[PDB]
A paper describes a structure:
PfRH5 is the best understood component of PfPCRCR and interacts with human membrane protein complexes containing the erythrocyte receptor basigin. Antibodies which target PfRH5 are highly effective at preventing erythrocyte invasion and the most potent growth-inhibitory antibodies bind a single epitope. Here we use structure-guided approaches to design a small synthetic immunogen, RH5-34EM which recapitulates this epitope. Structural biology and biophysics demonstrate that RH5-34EM is correctly folded and binds neutralising monoclonal antibodies with nanomolar affinity.
The most effective growth-inhibitory antibody from this panel, R5.016, bound to an epitope which overlapped that of 9AD4. We previously determined the structure of the R5.016 bound to PfRH5 and find that 13/15 of the residues on PfRH5 contacted by R5.016 are retained in our epitope mimic designs. R5.016 bound with lower affinity to RH5-34EM than PfRH5, although still in the nanomolar range (115 nM vs 2.4 nM). We next determined crystal structures of the RH5-34EM epitope mimic bound to scFv fragments of human monoclonal antibodies R5.016 (at 1.63 Å resolution) and R5.034 (at 1.75 Å resolution). Comparison of these structures with those of PfRH5 bound to R5.016 and R5.034 showed significant similarity, both in the fold of the epitope mimic and in the interactions that it makes with antibodies. Of the 15 interactions formed between PfRH5 and R5.016, 13 were retained with the epitope mimic. In the case of R5.034, of the 10 interactions made with PfRH5, 9 were also observed with the epitope mimic. These structural alignments also confirmed that RH5-34EM more correctly recapitulates the epitope for R5.034 than that for R5.016, with R5.034 binding closer to the centre of the RH5-34EM immunogen, while R5.016 binds more towards the tip of the immunogen, where the structural similarity to PfRH5 starts to diverge. Production of our focused immunogen involved grafting the 9AD4/R5.016/R5.034 epitope onto a small scaffold protein and redesigning the resultant molecule to ensure that it folds correctly. This was successful, with structural studies showing that both R5.016 and R5.034 bind to the synthetic immunogen with the expected binding mode.
Author numbering: 5 to 76, 86 to 119
Write the structure that this text describes.
């Protein structure tokens, strides 16, 4: 049903968002203290970008599949809600990357 599809897509996006927040918390807590050379910063930035781009692939897949299922009344309200949730997740993922680059450039 459109109700189950909506609820499940939102639940999956919430899980991806929490995984991104937990990853960010783990960066600040578990990362080791070494000489922050230009090379160290570039190596860490490319890995963080790769990790966050893979989180974005998961969010994109959940959103595209939810929209596709809702396409095949209140169904339009659900599509708007899932798309708004996908956009906000994308902005949050972008804000994590920006804070991480600022954190490495300290």
């Amino acid at each position: 049903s459109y109700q189950d599809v909506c609820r499940k897509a939102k639940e999956k996006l919430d899980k991806i968002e929490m995984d991104a927040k937990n990853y960010e918390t783990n960066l600040k807590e578990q990362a080791n203290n070494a000489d922050k050379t230009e090379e160290y910063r570039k190596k860490k930035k490319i890995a963080i970008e790769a990790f966050l781009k893979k989180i974005e692939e998961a969010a994109d897949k959940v959103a595209r599949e939810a929209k596709q299922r809702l396409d095949e009344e209140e169904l339009e309200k659900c599509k708007e809600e899932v798309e708004k949730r996908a956009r906000e997740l994308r902005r949050r993922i972008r804000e994590i990357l920006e804070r991480a680059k600022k954190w490495l450039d300290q």
